[PDB]
RNA sequence: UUUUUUUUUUUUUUUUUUUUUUUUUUUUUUUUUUUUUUUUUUUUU
């Protein structure tokens, strides 16, 4: 019920439209996931994931 | 012609000092040369 897959939604602008002030979708709030994700990606020859914090 | 220690004397003989010391240790603290507001490819459509 968060319209995150919907074509033209407000969701992508939750921060700047001031709908939210603490994003659930952020990587700060998703630290473990962000890691494991980028790590696997890197082993799989990603260049994007190379410089991920 | 020599002489054949780039040896030498008079004792001597730590580029040893004793006065006590002896972390080029002080800490009252307090110790990521971390820090928060999201964020977190020196990503772009």
User: CB less than 7 Å from strand B: which protein residues?
Assistant: A 15, 21-23, 26-29, 31, 34, 47-48, 50-53
Which positions on chain B have an atom < 7 Å from some protein CB? 37-43
CA distance A42 to A9: 31
What Rg, from alpha-carbon coordinates, does chain A have? 14
Asked whether residue A6 is marked as a ligand-binding residue, the answer is no
Give the up-direction half-sphere exposure of residue A31: CA atoms within 13 A in the CB hemisphere: 1
Indicate the SS3 state at residue A31. helix
**Token pair for A2:** 């968060």
Q: How far is the CA of A48 from the C1' of B43 (A)?
A: 8
Which of A15, A42, A46 shows the shortest CA–CA distance to A28? A15
């Amino acid at each position: 019920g968060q319209e995150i897959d919907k074509a033209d939604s407000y969701m992508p602008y939750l921060i700047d439209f001031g709908l939210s002030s603490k994003s659930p979708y952020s990587s700060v709030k998703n630290p473990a996931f962000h890691f494991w994700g980028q790590l696997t990606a890197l082993l799989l020859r990603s260049t994007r994931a190379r410089n991920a914090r």
